[PDB]
């Protein structure tokens, strides 16, 4: 299928408790592979996946040098955006950054993106042509002009079309035996009586990768959404993911309901009925 490399930065100011915290994580699809924590002992980029551990020492200190530079500019950006919004220096504030690049099964560039945030709200985002920006408020429009004058959109695009797409390919072949695996969901259904009149059917999906999955409930062949509960897809901790979808039905009518499971590892969708 198609794959994506994504990095997630977080910078949280803590006034009077030292310089702001900085956490960087890198993902290939739903597989984390690198980490950086300013509060950690290493102070370096660290591997979080086996297939990245085979990179030479020149890879790690350059990835440390660049990610430390980002964290240092994230720190000054926190003091600058504080001024844009006329905020007190006693308050704690958060800068979040996400960027990445997508490739197809043929290895061709598909897409690039970058979006920044302040205190959980949009701040500035790279446009789809990778040559323009969109500011979320008048504070971000000052940054937008600073980045237009600095030609920041072309620095980001040279990376998204350049080493991002290429190193994503390199990661995809070195970790091929786990990154390109397809773990189909292992499915089963449970039944718990609610009352003398109603029961709950729960459709389970376990041990699947990647995390994208659609779990459908159908009565009489029609989709059901009332009396439904669907939990957020959750990580199992071993690299796989879990999810379930429940529905409460009149007792005795359990058999009119069908659960549908679609996933990448399933060429044919799975269908579950109570029997």
């Amino acid at each position: 299928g198609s794959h994506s490399m994504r990095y997630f930065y977080t910078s949280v100011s803590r006034p009077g408790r030292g310089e702001p915290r900085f956490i960087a994580v890198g993902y290939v699809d739903d597989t984390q592979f690198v980490r950086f924590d300013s509060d950690a002992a290493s102070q370096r980029m660290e591997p979080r996946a086996p297939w990245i551990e085979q990179e030479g020492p020149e890879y790690w200190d350059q990835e440390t040098r660049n990610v430390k530079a980002q964290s240092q500019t994230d720190r000054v950006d926190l003091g600058t955006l504080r001024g844009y919004y006329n905020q007190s220096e006693d308050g704690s504030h958060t800068i979040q950054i996400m960027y990445g690049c997508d490739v197809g099964p043929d290895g061709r560039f598909l897409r690039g993106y970058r979006q920044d945030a302040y205190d959980g709200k949009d701040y500035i985002a790279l446009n789809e042509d990778l040559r323009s920006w969109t500011a979320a408020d008048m504070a971000a429009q000052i940054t937008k002009r600073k980045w237009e004058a600095a030609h920041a959109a072309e620095q980001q695009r040279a990376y998204l079309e350049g080493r991002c797409v290429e190193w994503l390919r390199r990661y995809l072949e070195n970790g091929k035996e786990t990154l390109q695996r397809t773990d189909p969901p292992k499915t089963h259904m449970t039944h718990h009586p609610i009352s003398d009149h109603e029961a709950t059917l729960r459709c389970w999906a376990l041990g699947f990768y990647p995390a994208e999955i659609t779990l459908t409930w159908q009565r009489d062949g029609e989709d059901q959404t009332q009396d439904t509960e669907l939990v957020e897809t959750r990580p199992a901790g071993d690299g796989t993911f879990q999810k379930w979808a429940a529905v409460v039905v009149p007792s005795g009518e359990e058999q009119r309901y069908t659960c549908h499971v679609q996933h990448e590892g399933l060429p044919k969708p799975l269908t579950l009925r109570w029997e």
Partner: peptide, 10 residues
């Protein structure tokens, strides 16, 4: 690998 540069500050 991570991106570098991209501006001179916000």
């Amino acid at each position: 690998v991570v991106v570098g540069a991209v501006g001179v500050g916000k």
